[PDB]
Structure formats: structure tokens, C-alpha cells
Write an enzyme that holds these catalytic residues in place. Sequence first.
Site, PDB file in Angstrom:
ATOM      1  N   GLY A  11       0.858  -1.257   0.148  1.00  0.00           N
ATOM      2  CA  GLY A  11      -0.072   0.113   0.139  1.00  0.00           C
ATOM      3  C   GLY A  11       0.820   1.113  -0.014  1.00  0.00           C
ATOM      4  CB  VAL A  24      17.710   9.458  -4.457  1.00  0.00           C
ATOM      5  CG1 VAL A  24      18.411  10.181  -5.507  1.00  0.00           C
ATOM      6  CG2 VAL A  24      17.014   8.204  -4.978  1.00  0.00           C
ATOM      7  NE  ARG A  25      18.244  15.639  -4.204  1.00  0.00           N
ATOM      8  CZ  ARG A  25      17.507  16.498  -4.266  1.00  0.00           C
ATOM      9  NH1 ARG A  25      17.040  17.124  -2.935  1.00  0.00           N
ATOM     10  NH2 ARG A  25      16.806  16.677  -5.382  1.00  0.00           N
ATOM     11  NE  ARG A  72      -1.997  -5.137  -7.165  1.00  0.00           N
ATOM     12  CZ  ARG A  72      -1.179  -4.102  -7.629  1.00  0.00           C
ATOM     13  NH1 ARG A  72      -1.112  -2.893  -6.799  1.00  0.00           N
ATOM     14  NH2 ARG A  72      -1.195  -3.824  -8.907  1.00  0.00           N
ATOM     15  CG  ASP A 103       3.772  -6.789   8.032  1.00  0.00           C
ATOM     16  OD1 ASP A 103       2.754  -6.260   7.274  1.00  0.00           O
ATOM     17  OD2 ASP A 103       2.969  -7.446   8.918  1.00  0.00           O
ATOM     18  CB  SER A 105       7.220  -4.811   1.123  1.00  0.00           C
ATOM     19  OG  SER A 105       6.080  -4.344   0.737  1.00  0.00           O
ATOM     20  CB  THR A 127       2.696   0.554   6.239  1.00  0.00           C
ATOM     21  OG1 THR A 127       1.377   0.150   6.391  1.00  0.00           O
ATOM     22  CG2 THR A 127       3.796   0.310   7.225  1.00  0.00           C
ATOM     23  CG  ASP A 129      -1.073  -1.786   8.993  1.00  0.00           C
ATOM     24  OD1 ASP A 129      -2.080  -2.323   9.956  1.00  0.00           O
ATOM     25  OD2 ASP A 129      -1.480  -1.993   7.916  1.00  0.00           O
ATOM     26  CG  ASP A 131       1.330  -2.651   9.899  1.00  0.00           C
ATOM     27  OD1 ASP A 131       1.982  -1.629   9.924  1.00  0.00           O
ATOM     28  OD2 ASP A 131       0.831  -3.391   8.953  1.00  0.00           O
ATOM     29  NE  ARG A 173      -2.024  -5.700   5.877  1.00  0.00           N
ATOM     30  CZ  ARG A 173      -2.149  -6.138   4.665  1.00  0.00           C
ATOM     31  NH1 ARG A 173      -3.305  -6.956   4.313  1.00  0.00           N
ATOM     32  NH2 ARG A 173      -1.510  -5.770   3.507  1.00  0.00           N
ATOM     33  CG  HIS A 217     -24.225  15.017  15.115  1.00  0.00           C
ATOM     34  ND1 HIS A 217     -25.081  15.163  13.904  1.00  0.00           N
ATOM     35  CD2 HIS A 217     -24.392  16.500  15.719  1.00  0.00           C
ATOM     36  CE1 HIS A 217     -25.604  16.160  13.537  1.00  0.00           C
ATOM     37  NE2 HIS A 217     -25.227  17.101  14.578  1.00  0.00           N
ATOM     38  NE  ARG A 245     -22.997  11.929   5.897  1.00  0.00           N
ATOM     39  CZ  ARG A 245     -21.911  12.229   5.174  1.00  0.00           C
ATOM     40  NH1 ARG A 245     -20.724  11.784   5.180  1.00  0.00           N
ATOM     41  NH2 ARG A 245     -22.154  13.037   4.320  1.00  0.00           N
TER      42      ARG A 245
HETATM   43  N1  LIG Z   1       5.123 -13.189   3.120  1.00  0.00           N
HETATM   44  C1  LIG Z   1       5.819 -12.853   1.894  1.00  0.00           C
HETATM   45  N2  LIG Z   1       6.826 -13.729   1.220  1.00  0.00           N
HETATM   46  C2  LIG Z   1       7.502 -12.915   0.174  1.00  0.00           C
HETATM   47  N3  LIG Z   1       7.098 -12.004  -0.466  1.00  0.00           N
HETATM   48  C3  LIG Z   1       5.760 -11.145   0.085  1.00  0.00           C
HETATM   49  C4  LIG Z   1       5.122 -11.545   1.338  1.00  0.00           C
HETATM   50  N4  LIG Z   1       4.212 -10.725   1.463  1.00  0.00           N
HETATM   51  C5  LIG Z   1       4.204  -9.801   0.535  1.00  0.00           C
HETATM   52  N5  LIG Z   1       5.147  -9.837  -0.379  1.00  0.00           N
HETATM   53  C6  LIG Z   1       5.357  -9.479  -1.514  1.00  0.00           C
HETATM   54  O1  LIG Z   1       5.392  -7.823  -0.967  1.00  0.00           O
HETATM   55  C7  LIG Z   1       4.259  -7.338  -1.451  1.00  0.00           C
HETATM   56  C8  LIG Z   1       3.887  -6.920  -0.134  1.00  0.00           C
HETATM   57  O2  LIG Z   1       2.429  -7.069  -0.211  1.00  0.00           O
HETATM   58  P1  LIG Z   1       1.786  -6.237   1.116  1.00  0.00           P
HETATM   59  O3  LIG Z   1       1.866  -7.402   2.213  1.00  0.00           O
HETATM   60  O4  LIG Z   1       0.180  -5.742   0.479  1.00  0.00           O
HETATM   61  O5  LIG Z   1       2.482  -5.178   1.387  1.00  0.00           O
HETATM   62  P2  LIG Z   1       2.607  -4.449   2.808  1.00  0.00           P
HETATM   63  O6  LIG Z   1       4.132  -3.980   2.786  1.00  0.00           O
HETATM   64  O7  LIG Z   1       2.364  -5.309   4.064  1.00  0.00           O
HETATM   65  N6  LIG Z   1       1.880  -2.914   2.957  1.00  0.00           N
HETATM   66  P3  LIG Z   1       0.372  -2.737   3.513  1.00  0.00           P
HETATM   67  O8  LIG Z   1      -0.559  -3.570   2.685  1.00  0.00           O
HETATM   68  O9  LIG Z   1       0.017  -1.218   3.611  1.00  0.00           O
HETATM   69  O10 LIG Z   1       0.617  -3.538   5.003  1.00  0.00           O
HETATM   70  C9  LIG Z   1       3.535  -8.534  -2.091  1.00  0.00           C
HETATM   71  O11 LIG Z   1       2.671  -8.072  -3.359  1.00  0.00           O
HETATM   72  C10 LIG Z   1       4.556  -9.527  -2.497  1.00  0.00           C
HETATM   73  O12 LIG Z   1       5.157  -9.061  -3.838  1.00  0.00           O
END
Ligand SMILES: Nc1ncnc2c1ncn2[C@@H]1O[C@H](COP(=O)(O)OP(=O)(O)NP(=O)(O)O)[C@@H](O)[C@H]1O
Lengths: 318, 318
Positions: A11, A24-25, A72, A103, A105, A127, A129, A131, A173, A217, A245
Site C-alpha cells: 500500500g 537517493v540524495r 502487488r 511487513d 514487503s 505504511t 498501519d 503494525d 489492517r 451527534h 451516517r
Molecule cells: N510473506 C511474503 N513472502 C514473500 N513476499 C511477500 C510476502 N508478503 C508480501 N510479499 C511481497 O511484497 C508485496 C507486499 O504486499 P503487502 O503485504 O500488501 O504489502 P505491505 O508491505 O504489508 N503494505 P500494507 O498493505 O500497507 O501493509 C506483495 O505483493 C509481494 O509482492
Amino acid sequence: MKKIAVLTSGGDSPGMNAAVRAVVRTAIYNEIEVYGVYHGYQGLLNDDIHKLELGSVGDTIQRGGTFLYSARCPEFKEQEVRKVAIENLRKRGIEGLVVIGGDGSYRGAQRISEECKEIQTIGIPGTIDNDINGTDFTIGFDTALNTIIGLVDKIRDTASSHARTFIIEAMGRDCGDLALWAGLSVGAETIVVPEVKTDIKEIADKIEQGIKRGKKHSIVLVAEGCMTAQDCQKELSQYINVDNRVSVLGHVQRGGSPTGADRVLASRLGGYAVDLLMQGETAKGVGIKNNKIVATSFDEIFDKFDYSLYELANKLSI
Amino acid sequence: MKKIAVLTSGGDSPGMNAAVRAVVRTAIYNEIEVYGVYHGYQGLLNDDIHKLELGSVGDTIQRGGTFLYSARCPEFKEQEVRKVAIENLRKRGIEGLVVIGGDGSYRGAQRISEECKEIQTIGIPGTIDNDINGTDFTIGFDTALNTIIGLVDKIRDTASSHARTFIIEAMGRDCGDLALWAGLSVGAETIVVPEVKTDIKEIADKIEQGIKRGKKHSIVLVAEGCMTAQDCQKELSQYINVDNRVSVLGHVQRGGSPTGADRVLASRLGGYAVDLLMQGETAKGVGIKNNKIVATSFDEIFDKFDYSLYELANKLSI
Ligand SMILES: Nc1ncnc2c1ncn2[C@@H]1O[C@H](COP(=O)(O)OP(=O)(O)NP(=O)(O)O)[C@@H](O)[C@H]1O
Ligand SMILES: Nc1ncnc2c1ncn2[C@@H]1O[C@H](COP(=O)(O)OP(=O)(O)NP(=O)(O)O)[C@@H](O)[C@H]1O
């Protein structure tokens, strides 16, 4: 450490751009060549790798989302597929890879360290989250929180006065921090979060008990992890007559210009990530723990809830 | 602890209302009567003390400034005058007093503990400065920072394109944190702060060196403690030809709705202040130190600058 690649995954959250900008910088300043990977890990397989200059990240710090894109790539869960992504980096003499995401990614980044000793991997917590382990806040959280404040303030202002109730669905999440912090900030009478045992009787008991006592409200803030806004409106119609609402905030929470906290926080971690790659460290997530910049292994990360703050929210409502 | 008074003093900062709201709600919830003191310490002498109810602080959490007002009462530096303020509280059976202000307003609160064993005194850091000890951030700082982001973004957008330079004066008092955090967030090429030895030659050296190399506009962020915006424009005309947009942000930085961070942070400290008064403690400022709510004696408070973060700001600019 002579070449670094960087990528954005999962996300998109406010401050992803600032974080890239920082990486980068910092890298170029330390005379390291940097490569922008586009479209998350999909880019990595597509060989969507391009060399970046100082100008590549001008006029970005304030920008929502990410200018390399995100994807994704559920296929990245496979040894065989990841082989093709490591070659693409391997062939190009890239020794470090920086991953900005959640987590999920991170797990992808952990794999690449495990499956390639040649590439150092660092994770930056982009993120919404909150989380993620080893960081008190993630890059995106502070921005989202205000986005919720704002959109709530707007539902209030654009509403009929006949409306006694605002059942508002906030994004996290599996983590109720956003809804607790947002709930507190808009002075919400109920806050529904996955971590606390939710008493719908008690919540309707409360709405009936204080509106019909002359409250304009009440607002109920709801964590998506716990349940849907409509679910909460359904479950509340089981005791009491209310449907006023059901506003499902959604993906707007992901957008918008990062606030100050996220730009600064993103920049510090974007820098730090580059420092740690030069220091020769690997398989770590960077963050801020007790007002201190830190690194935590992907090990410890995959092996928070302030019930005090939640109790206070309820003291402050009635 | 059966009666508590609360007051707002010094420069008004975003979240003062949330902080009051927190104090009032927490106190009443614990069956303590609470008294609103109006117009800072001037109110205290004028006997501008009024009993507050739960409704007194409805629809305030999001409100800028303070709804009890604030004053300068330079006369509060005197034993004899303060005598009249203690009686006004003394006569009314008020055992605790809560002060929301800066380090100046704290000193007043410290005195009252020293000169009256009967009144417990706690301080809550309502100020923009980030100048206060035992707290990493004050209530107002995060809000101000974004106010600067926003107003800078607006100077950019409302400007001629002929303008190469934006010499922007940011408020702190003797603390360059705001300008450093704001400078970083709007990606400023120079940041002028009282803590670092300011090289105007080097700054003009830089503007000439990178604009005239094709930069739209450089922005210079300036801490009021260090110097005026016009001073910086004067001193820069001593090397180089520039006078393009000396924008003196001023008191707008004090206004506006508190952001999420300040409402939450204000609420936690507003609560905590009430807890500590019931615990029987006194002559302390409350705050957040290393992501932990804490109390620090007015002693330790009157007996910060991250040069790392400043260096990073400059890495990220050129
Ligand atoms: N458990 C895993 N093992 C290997 N690759 C993963 C795993 N989970 C996610 N990925 C890869 O990383 C991407 C991250 O997906 P996702 O879990 O939606 O992202 P996130 O980093 O948790 N961000 P958010 O969705 O905001 O929590 C996935 O589309 C995969 O390409
Ligand atoms: N050193 C002191 N001794 C006794 N009383 C003081 C002292 N300093 C300030 N006061 C009182 O408290 C008020 C606070 O003034 P000031 O120093 O402007 O506030 P502050 O709390 O530091 N807020 P800011 O101006 O934003 O830093 C003064 O008007 C006096 O009424």
C-alpha cells in the site's frame, strides 16, 4: 557498497517520496550510484530498473504516494521467481537493495538476503498501519491520522442536523492505533478496535444514554480489522434505532501530502538506511524506538496496544 | 485533592483547548470539582475563577487557541502580588492548580508551590518553542510545523516565476527546532538557527552556486532567535544580488486547529496532570521523554539540538 537500488512496495503511504528522496540524495552525496526500481517487485522481475540523479527526486518531498510505482507481486513468494529478480540486480552490479513498504514487503527483502549474500537488504516502514515491529510509528501514520480528523470534520459540516450518529470506518489492517488516535482527536464516544472485546450492547446503551440527553451527534470510530462500518450499523440496529451516517473513509487515507512528521521521519530513515548499507549491515528494518533511530533484524521483527490510551479516550467521552 | 483550578498562560498554542478539555473531563470523572481561571495569571488576581462542567469543554478539542484566555501579567514576578492570587485560590478551597504554558508560566507555578504548601502545582507544556525541558516535544510544535509547511507551499504557489529565492522567518524563540524540522520538510537549501555558526558568505555562495545553475527557487528558512528575515535579506545583499520574497510568517503559526499529534499529546498530559495531583505530587512539569509520559521537577527543568538532523537537511539539499 558502490551501487544501491531502491523500491516501493505494498500500500502506498504519505512520505514514500520523501523516503526515496532521502535515499537517493544521501547515496549520491556519498558517491554511490542509485537505481530506481519501478512498480514494486513487479518492476524487479520486468527489469524496470533505472539510474537516478539528484534531479530525479526534486519537487517530491511533499508529494503523496510514490513516483516509482507500487505493485502487488504475489508471485514473489516463490524461490524460482525471486531467482529472476536477483539476477536482474546481480547482472547490474547492485550490492545493496532498499525496500520501502510494510511487513509483507519486508519479507520479500528478508528472502533476498537469505538467497543472495551479495545483496545487502534494508527495510523502511512505509505504511499506514503502525503494525511494524521495532518502530513506534511508521511513515504514513501521522498523515493518515489527520486525513481522518479532516474528513470527519467535513462529514460533520456537510451533514443534516437531524443526524445524531456518525459510524466512521478507519483503515489499519490488524492494528487499532489509527482508530484510537483518530477517535481521541475527534473526541469520539465509542472506539471499536480489534484489541478490546467489543460490547455493542454497551455502545448502543451509550448512544441512547447520552444523545436523547441532548448531544448533537455521537461519533463511533471503527477499525476495519474489527469490523465494517455497515456491520457496526447493522449490529447496533439490533438494540436501538439508528442509521444515520455510515461513512466508509477508505483509500483517501492513503493519499495526500505527507505532514511534517512523515517527511522528517521518512528523511531520517531514508538517510539511516543508506548509512547502514555503507556500514555493511543487512536484513534489517530501520525505525524510531523510544525517540531513537534504530535497526532491528527481520528475525526479531517477525518473531504495541496502549490500553491506557484507550481508557483515556473513554474517560474523555463520558 | 477535592478542587482543581486550571489556567492558560503565555503565547497561545494549538492544543491548549484539548489540554483543558482533558483536565476538566478527567477531574470530574474522578469526582473532583474544577475551576476555570480566565486570562492567565491576570485572571488569578482579578478573581476571574469560574466553576466548569463537562459541557464547558464540549466542541473544543479541535479549537485553536484557548477558550479561557491568556495574558501577560509581568506583575506576577512579585511576592506581594502573588499573595493576592494565592488568597483567591486559598479562599475558594482550591488544593491543586494546573498551568498550561511555556517555561515562563511554569516559573509562576513553581513560585506558588514555594509560597503555598496548600496548593499542589503541575505544569503542562503548551508552547510552540520545543524549548521546554523534560519533554522531547511541546504541545503546539507539530501543529506549527505544518502551518509553516502550508504557508510556504502557498508563497510558492502565489508567487511570480521570476522569484529565485524565499527568505522565510519561522517562530521559535531561542530554539531552532521548528526551523530545522520545517526547513527539512519543505526541502530548504539553507536553514539558519541560533545553535549553528551562521556563514552568510557560504549561504550566498550556495544560492549563486545552484540557482543560476537552473533551480527555480531556493528557500532559506530562518529562526527568529537567530535573526530577522529582512536582516538575512540585508546580510545576503552584502555578497550577491537577491531580494525576492522576505515573508515574515509571524502569529499565524500560533493559530489554527491543532493537528492529531497535539490533540492526543495534549490529552495524555491533561489527564496525567490530574493523576499526579491525586497522587499528591507537586511542582512538576509533565511531558513525553523517549516515548514515555514523565514528570520532571521545576528544579530540574530550570537547571536538545540535534546537529545530526541539521547535517542531514544539508545533505538532502546539495
Ligand atoms: N510473506 C511474503 N513472502 C514473500 N513476499 C511477500 C510476502 N508478503 C508480501 N510479499 C511481497 O511484497 C508485496 C507486499 O504486499 P503487502 O503485504 O500488501 O504489502 P505491505 O508491505 O504489508 N503494505 P500494507 O498493505 O500497507 O501493509 C506483495 O505483493 C509481494 O509482492
Ligand atoms: N520568570 C518568571 N517569574 C514569575 N512569573 C513569570 C516569569 N516568567 C513569566 N511569568 C508569568 O507567566 C507569564 C508567561 O509569560 P511568557 O514567558 O510569555 O510565557 P511562556 O509560558 O514562556 N510562553 P511562550 O511565550 O510561548 O514561551 C508572564 O506574563 C508572567 O505573568
